[PDB]
Ligand binder design. Structure first.
Ligand SMILES: NCc1ccc(C(F)(F)F)o1
Length: 330
């Protein structure tokens, strides 16, 4: 089997991407944030504290003939931006782009933090990291991809995120029309439960490539590119007037600037992020200070190849017995 679904930016800055997912019988379609940095499929629901729902579409298990309470199971998760959610668990039929999994753990939110409430366009998350990170207790549950894997034509999914435009998540096949040149594959460590790999280095603009190992995670659920302070300083030093602002929470730059590109290495191959992808617009409405899309990972404890990086590439998440990651230009 295979599946293919369009993923759409939630706003004009590509702050996140949502993908329609069919849950239950008859189908209830919710728009979920596919997140290769976590492993829980959770949704706004009929059980979510009413004051914490503001415009989201909810899953109502009582209206699904295939929903079953997973007795005794609870979940609770916190994300890297400080947001969180928790609740109980059902199993139900879940389909993505024509690919169906029966008995998928669908984690129903009883509580969500303020930033989720404030995000009316995101109805939940669909985790695509390794199932070892799944938070369900006392019986850990599998991700959608892990449940689907055996049935897939090939044990892979791909992320093809658009810049200010829709893109695609495919399951079970590699669309050879969706990228240019060849796909370069690179080793993955699953030791921390992430799609963790090592970039071979970077360049800023038309500058020379610096060969240096940068360990980090391919994380579709993180908006920006978070890299070591040395690398980030070298980038922003090429933008007149750019500075790190503790009050804003990162590097900002004059909105009048033309940003340089940023290149990262994948083995001997190179992925180029155009300068425009690094612009996240005014820090507040009407401001001439703009927020940067490359930020320091110092304090996070891990480097994160988020959407800013991933959207410059066609990315293969290879879930073979020994997982790997593939990157191609597009
Ligand atoms: N800040 C709430 C929110 C929306 C999307 C996300 C997540 F992907 F990082 F989990 O968190």
């Amino acid at each position: 089997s295979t599946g293919s679904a369009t993923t759409t930016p939630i706003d004009s800055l590509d702050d996140a991407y949502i993908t329609p997912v069919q849950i239950g019988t008859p189908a209830q379609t919710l728009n979920l944030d596919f997140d290769t940095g976590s492993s829980d499929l959770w949704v706004f629901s009929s059980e979510t504290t009413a004051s914490e729902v503001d415009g989201q579409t909810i899953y109502t298990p009582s209206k699904s003939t295939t929903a079953k309470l997973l007795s005794g199971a609870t979940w609770s998760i916190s994300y890297g931006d400080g947001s969180s959610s928790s609740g109980d668990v059902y199993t139900d039929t879940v389909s993505v782009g024509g690919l169906t999994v029966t008995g998928q753990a669908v984690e129903s939110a009883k509580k969500v933090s303020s930033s989720f409430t404030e995000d009316s366009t995101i109805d939940g998350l669909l985790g695509l990291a390794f199932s070892t990170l799944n938070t369900v207790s006392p019986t850990q549950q599998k991700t959608f991809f892990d449940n689907a894997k055996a049935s897939l034509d090939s044990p892979v999914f791909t992320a093809d995120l658009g810049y200010h435009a829709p893109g695609t998540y495919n399951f079970g096949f590699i669309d050879t029309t969706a990228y240019t040149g060849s796909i370069t594959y690179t080793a993955v460590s699953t030791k921390q439960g992430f799609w963790e790999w090592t970039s071979t280095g970077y360049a800023v603009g038309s500058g020379t490539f610096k060969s240096t190992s940068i360990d980090g995670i391919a994380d579709t659920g993180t908006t920006l590119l978070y890299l070591p302070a040395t690398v980030v300083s070298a980038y922003w030093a090429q933008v007149s007037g750019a500075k790190s602002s503790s009050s804003v929470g990162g590097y900002v730059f004059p909105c009048s600037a033309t940003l340089p590109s940023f290149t990262f290495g994948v083995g001997s191959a190179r992925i180029v992020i155009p300068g425009d992808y690094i612009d996240f617009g005014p820090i507040s409405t009407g401001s001439s200070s703009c927020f940067g899309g490359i930020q320091s990972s110092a304090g996070i404890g891990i480097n994160i190849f988020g959407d800013v990086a991933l959207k410059a590439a066609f990315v293969v998440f290879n879930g073979a017995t020994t997982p790997t990651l593939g990157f191609a230009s597009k």
